[PDB]
DNA sequence: GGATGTATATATCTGACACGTGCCTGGAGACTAGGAAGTAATCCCCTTGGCGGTTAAAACGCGGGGGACAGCGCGTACGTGCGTTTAAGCGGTTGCTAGAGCTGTCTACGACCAATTGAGCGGCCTCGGCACCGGGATTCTCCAGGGCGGC
């Protein structure tokens, strides 16, 4: 049985994803989600294609951007494995937690 | 002797160039008012190079221990791969409504201008409170007289 070790194949993702430039959430549920969260403001919201589009790529950008910083944070602590204390750091020193 | 590889010619597809038209927005020409450039005066802050004295911060050295880092073990949690499910993606129905665009009318609301005056800025006088000076009441230290002992 042929096998691959633990994190080539990550390393071809990465270099897959990073040449890649379409969006890597799926429309219909982003589309639900952002449906959802709007109904909490303001009952009765049509929505646009073009508003969902932006909504997404404006969303995967801050959620890549914070991935980047996420990872700058596992390496400065000497780790190759992400943490929710990296996102909380990352948050925290870019300001939009604390 | 038959069929296969390859060259040249002809029809068709497709991006690009030029022609046409509207229209509306930018440009040309003229006039005017005020924004800003320039001028003079006054006054206060900043510059550069000094001096003097205080003093607390900065610098230096040294001992020591707390913490950073390296190494090792371990166990668990995440990566990887495969089979199965499921839901995204596409195409489609069917009506109604929201909204952009366009046209039209009108009316209330805000710009604008003149006269007015009352709220904002500065100084002056006074009070509330804190402080300086004079006088009365209370408590502490001291000098002298009386009595006792010794030669």
């Known amino acids: 049985p042929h096998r691959y070790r633990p994190g080539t194949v990550a390393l071809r993702e990465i270099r897959r994803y990073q040449k890649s430039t379409e969006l890597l ?3 219909l549920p982003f589309q639900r989600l952002v449906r ?3 109904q909490d403001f303001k009952t009765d919201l049509r929505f646009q294609s073009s508003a969902v589009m932006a909504l997404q790529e404006a969303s995967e950008a ?3 951007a914070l991935f980047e910083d996420t990872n700058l944070c596992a390496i400065h602590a000497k780790r190759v494995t ?3 204390k990296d996102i909380q750091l990352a948050r925290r020193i870019r300001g939009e937690r604390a």
């Open 82 to 84: 992400i943490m929710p």
């Open 25 to 27: 959430i799926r429309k």
């Open 36 to 38: 959802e969260i709007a």
């Open 62 to 64: 801050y959620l890549v």
